[PDB]
Amino acid sequence: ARSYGNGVYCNNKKCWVNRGEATQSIIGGMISGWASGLAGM
Structure with missing residues (x-):
């Protein structure tokens, strides 16, 4: 469990990595x- 920002400890069921990096x-x-x-219905 974490709360350093908007995620860190993954969303819930999924699991993202490097938001900024990926974003940028x-x-x-x-x-x-x-x-x-949007495209996904």
């Missing part, structure tokens, strides 16, 4: 999800 990443992890959400 060209690939865009977070974004990919946003688009995945």
Whole structure:
């Protein structure tokens, strides 16, 4: 269990790694999800 920010100890069932890095990443992890959400019905 943690609470250093918005996650750290994963979301709940999933498990993300390096938010900022991934975010700032060209690939865009977070974004990919946003688009995945909208596109994902």
